[PDB]
Structures are given as C-alpha cells and as structure tokens.
C-alpha cells in the first residue's frame, strides 16, 4: 500500500506525461521506450483480437459438428405465425431485428416475422391453433366424426423454427417503431375512453374491511409484476411506507408491501397505466398516536 | 462538492520558486514539494483533463464525501417537538421533493419530430380538453428546434467525417455544460488521431501475423 | 397530481423543455402557455361489482386448485422478445418504451430454488404602531395549512 500510493501519485501521471502527444506526433524523436510501449499496445491488440476470433468461432464449429453427427406450406406457416403475432402484440407496435455479424456490423433482418405481422397480403381453423395437445385433439376428432402426418410435419418444422429462433436470438438487437395514429387511437380509446365504474372505489375498501388479512409481498416481484401490467389498483399509504393493492386475479386479493422511495416507482406505476387514489384519514387517527 | 463526492482530487504544482542556478526538472520540483516550497492546489475531478494528475484523497471530506452542515450548529442541533411519534405525510413529501421524477427517459426519446410533436402539442390538448394557439405552438416549436441543435452537431461529430475537429469546436462552443461531459469529444485530437493510425497499423500487423502463421503446417 | 406529474398539467411542458439541462430570466413562457389555452373540447359510489369480483374468485378457486392438484406435484428436497410488451394497452407499451431504453432490467424474481427453499416443483396605543414598525419579519426563511396549526396547538396542549 505504501508503494501503491507513490505509484499512483508519481508514475502513472509521469507515464502519461512521457506518453503525452506533443512529442508522439513528431516521429523523428521517438525514443526506444516509446517504441516498446507501441509494441506492447500492438501485442495486446493482437492477443485480444486472435483470442476473440477463436472464442467466437469455436461454438460455430461446435454446432456444425453437432448437426453433422446428428444427421403445411411455407405460406401456411407464415400465416400461422401471422395469426399468433396478431394474437400476441397490439396494433401499432413494430419490432425490427438487427443481427450482430462477426465483423462488427449490425445487419437488417428483413425476414423477421415481427416486421410485417400486422400488414395484410373447418380444418384450417384448427391448423392455426397450437394451444391444445395432439392427444386431446385426436380424441376429440374421433368424437367429431372425421392426417396425423400433417400434424407430425407441423410439429417437426415448428421445432425447427423454434431452434432457429433460439439460435438467432443470441447475437441480436431490436428496434421498436410506432404507428402514432394507432397510439393516439389507443389513447382516445382507453385513456379518455376508460369508462370503468370504479372511479374512486379503492381506499374505502381498506377502511371498511379493516378486519381482513393481508400477507407480505416482495418488492422486485411487485416491479416485475407491474411491468407486465397485471395490476389495476395501487393504493398508497400517506407516509410512503406501506401498500394495499386490490389485485385482479388470485387469492387473497389484497396484500401488504413496504416501499423504498424512488421516482422510478412513479414511472413504472404510470407506465403500467394503473389507477392511483389516496387513502385519507381523520385527524383523530393521528391524534391518538 | 469540491471533489464532487468522489473523494479524490488532483494535486497540482502551480508555481515553484526555483533556486537561481537550476532547471525546471520534475525531481527539483519534487525536492521543493517535500520541503513544501511549491504551490499545492486541489482541483476537482469534474474538470476532465487529458493528463491524469496525481489524485489524492480530498482534505475536506476525509475520504467520506459527506459533510455535516455548518449552519446547523450544536446548540441548535435539537428540536423539542414530538415529530418521531407524530411523523406526518409532509416529511414524506419533503424527502420526496428532491428526486425530480426523471424526464430524461422521454426527453432522450424526444429527438424525433413525430414523438416530440405528439408529446409537445397534441397529447395535452387531448387529455386536458383544450386547444393551443398558433403563436403558442410556433414559440414552442421554435424553442425546441433551438434546443435540438446541440445533439444535431453531436451526431455530426460522432460520424467522424473528415475535419470533424472543426465541428467538434462548434460542439464545444454551442453549449459548454453538456460539452464538458460527453465522451464523444476527445480531449486531445492528435492523441486519438495517431492512436487510430496506430490501431490500424496494429490490425494489419495482426492479420499479417495471423496469415503467416498458416504456412508452417503442411 | 404531485405524485404522478403526468395527468394520466402545464408544468409538464416547462419541465421537459426548459428545466432539463444561471439566471434564465424566463417566467413569461409559463403564463403565455397556460393562459394561451382555451378549453374548447353523480356522487354515488357503487359497492356491487368489487364485491362480486371476489365471489367470482371464490367460485374459480375450486376448479383451479383441483386442476393444479391433478397435474403438478411437489417434493421436499414466440412473442416480441421483451416481456413488458405483453398484455397491456398500447399506450402502456408506448410509455414503457421510454423507460426500458435505459432500464432493461426486470429484476428477474422468477428464481426461488436456493438452499433457502428446499422444496421443488415437478411440472407434469401610543407605542403600538412603533412596535408594528419595529418587528423584523422581512426574511421569512421558513419554506402548510391552518388546520395543521390547530392540531399543533392541541398537541402542544
């Protein structure tokens, strides 16, 4: 520690002072130590670059060897993915995928199915639904009075596309693009058009059913639960120390948490779009304290 | 604040009284320093200097970074009110009122005409149930287009077009308080220029080595 | 309104335009914005639906728990690839995107299988005016409400 302080105080400032660039640019007076430092930088860069080349290229050859040793129309598959993407994401939310190339340039994926999901172009009402097991589907189809190779091939190419998307999600970034006429339409629809009869019915519930029970809930669970918008009620305590939710599914329906004070709590509470009210007391509740 | 809470300020020798007969040598400066005949000045780490000066622990903060308030005196360090049993919501608001609810997460999304036009003109008109006036919208948009100039020139500099140093002086001239913090402005232009040429020479030498290593196994 | 500054009102535009980085001298813009805005666009709290919702929960519990018992056991010892995009209104996703630019972290409270949880699942009046002029109140330096003063006086009592 005694030598470390002297190191930090004198050597590194003088190391930069010798490595300063008022004499570096003049190549006609480069000393031997300057050339040694240049060689050190070049060798470090060579080591790092070759190491990352080997580290990047190793799993590619690994998967190539795995595939070598291991070794319903495409329009219909695209339409089935289209139906699932129409089910999943709301209208007015586009997602572009960029793939990280080995050289270092981000390439545009024009074949991503999040690029043109919402853009337009008896048995097939069943082929576009993979949400019920094949055993139940066959048992029910016999009860209907009516092809197993079709479902087998659907399963095979489904798992193929699943593994390909798992492969392509490793080195990729994503960019969202919005459709503001649709954002404004959802604004008019569910923010000024939110006509729920529960305008201010959140705290008087606490006051009435004081004689109920609430168990304890964690914090980061509450944040991760509010990010996915599973909460339609957030009721604060006056002193920013406690919470009483009235949650929309499960049992019991109301909990207790305690909160550390951060603005991003306000940001996430508003980002989820959850109603906010205020539980106001008398003075006699604070006066008997 | 004088270390900006870091607790490591740069110690610098401003003026040294040299004995008549010597040269301005770093060793003689140190000889004056150990006898305290050189001006030891403390500079905050906020001023990003190209040369890392010797960083020593801040004399004011004792390495803590937290200072007790000298306006709060020992005789007036005590209250008599029953605040601990009777904490009201206004103490919660008082500790609340200095964290500002960050607007930056949307402001850094406002560098776009459509998003900033939605946030700047239309959405308040929708929720509040009113309409702006023409001169109000014009002044809003004019001040906003005055504000966007800094990140416009920032993006122009970041591409590293030839002669970006002149645009970099433009960046440091238009708005200094943001210019003293961005990493996109290199402090020493010859440093990064010859480091770029040195990295280029390094990468060609690396590919020549990686190509010449392939002719010894056959 | 001071807890959630967004109205889910004119302080928004001043906060996002001017306040985000000496004198700055410009308070007239605030008034010119708010007063340059012309508005041109049953006190009965029903207790029934919020009472019916938990009864519906009570009804659903029986089937949910029986299905859970029939399927899963325990022992003693796709979509857009960001999760917040799921099951929210479109503006919820639009305002979450401004935060998720820097705050990608969901804090990931899906893991529970540590040593702390051994169990694992198995999916299957002369001087009075002089007194008035004498008193030094020119510097305030306090920085509430009169009913608060009432309870403070009662508490002091």
């Amino acid at each position: 520690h005694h030598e470390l302080t002297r190191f930090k105080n004198e050597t590194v400032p003088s190391f930069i002072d010798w490595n300063k660039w008022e004499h570096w640019k003049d190549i006609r007076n480069w000393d031997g130590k300057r050339v040694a430092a240049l060689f050190i930088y070049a060798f470090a860069l060579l080591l790092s670059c070759q190491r990352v080349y080997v580290a990047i290229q190793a799993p590619r050859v690994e998967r190539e060897r795995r595939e070598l040793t291991e070794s319903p129309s495409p329009g219909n598959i695209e339409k089935f993915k289209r139906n699932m993407w129409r089910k999943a994401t709301p209208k007015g939310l586009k997602l572009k995928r960029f793939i990280e190339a080995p050289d270092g340039t981000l390439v545009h994926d024009s074949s991503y199915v999040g690029e043109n999901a919402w853009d337009d172009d008896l048995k097939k009402i069943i082929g576009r639904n993979a949400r019920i097991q094949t055993e139940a589907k066959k048992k029910l189809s016999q009860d209907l009075g009516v092809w197993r190779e079709r479902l087998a091939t659907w399963k095979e190419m489904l798992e193929r596309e699943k593994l390909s998307e798992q492969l392509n999600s490793s080195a990729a970034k994503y960019v969202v693009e919005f459709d503001m006429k649709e954002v404004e339409k959802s604004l008019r629809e569910d923010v000024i058009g939110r006509t729920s009869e529960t305008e201010g019915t959140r705290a008087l519930w606490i006051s009435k059913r004081w004689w109920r029970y609430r168990p304890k809930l964690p914090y980061t669970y509450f944040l991760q639960k509010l990010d996915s918008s599973e909460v339609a009620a957030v009721v604060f305590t006056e002193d920013l120390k406690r919470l009483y939710v009235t949650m929309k599914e499960g049992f019991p329906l109301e909990y207790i948490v305690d909160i550390p004070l951060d603005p991003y709590l306000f940001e996430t509470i508003c980002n989820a779009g959850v109603e906010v009210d205020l539980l106001q007391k008398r003075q006699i509740h604070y006066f008997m304290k | 604040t004088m270390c900006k809470g870091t607790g490591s300020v740069h110690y610098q020798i401003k003026d040294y009284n040299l004995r008549s007969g010597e040269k301005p040598t770093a060793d003689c400066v140190a000889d004056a320093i150990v006898e305290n005949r050189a001006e030891l000045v403390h500079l905050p780490s906020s001023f990003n200097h190209s040369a890392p000066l010797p960083s020593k622990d801040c004399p004011t903060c004792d390495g803590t970074g937290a200072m007790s308030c000298t306006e709060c005196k020992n005789k007036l360090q005590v209250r008599i009110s029953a605040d601990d049993i009777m904490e009201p919501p206004w103490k919660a608001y008082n500790v609340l009122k200095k964290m500002d609810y960050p607007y930056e997460h949307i402001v850094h999304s406002m560098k776009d005409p459509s998003i900033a036009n939605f946030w700047l003109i239309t959405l308040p008109q929708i929720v509040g149930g009113f309409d702006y006036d023409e001169d109000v919208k014009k002044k809003i948009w004019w001040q906003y287009e005055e504000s966007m100039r800094y990140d416009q020139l920032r993006d122009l500099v970041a591409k590293r077009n030839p002669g970006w140093e002149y645009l970099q002086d433009a960046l440091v001239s238009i708005d200094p308080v943001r210019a003293r913090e961005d990493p996109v402005i290199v402090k020493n232009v010859p440093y990064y220029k010859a480091k770029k040429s040195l990295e280029a020479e390094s990468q060609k030498k690396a590919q020549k080595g990686s190509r010449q290593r392939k002719w010894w196994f056959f | 309104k001071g807890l959630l500054p967004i109205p889910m009102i004119n302080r928004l535009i001043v906060s996002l335009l001017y306040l985000t980085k000496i004198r700055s001298f410009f308070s007239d813009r605030w008034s010119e914005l708010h007063l340059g805005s012309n508005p041109t666009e049953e006190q009965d709290v029903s207790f029934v639906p919020s009472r019916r919702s938990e009864n519906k929960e009570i009804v659903n519990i029986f089937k949910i728990i029986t299905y859970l018992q029939n399927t899963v056991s325990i022992h003693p010892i796709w979509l857009n690839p960001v999760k917040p995009f799921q099951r929210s209104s479109l503006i919820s996703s639009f305002s979450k995107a401004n935060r998720l630019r820097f705050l990608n972290n969901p804090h990931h409270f899906c893991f529970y299988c540590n040593k702390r949880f051994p169990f694992y699942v198995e999916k299957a009046l002369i001087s009075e005016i002089s007194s008035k002029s004498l008193h030094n109140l020119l510097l305030s330096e306090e920085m509430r409400s009169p009913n608060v003063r009432e309870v403070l006086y009662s508490i002091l009592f």
Binding site: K173, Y174, V175 | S109 | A97, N104
Partner: peptide
C-alpha cells in the same frame, strides 16, 4: 438488449 428506438441508429 434493451430498446433501441430508430433515432439512436438512424441519427
């Protein structure tokens, strides 16, 4: 990764 809205990459 996070969210990387157009104007980060376009400009």
């Amino acid at each position: 990764x996070x969210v990387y809205v157009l104007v980060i990459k376009v400009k």
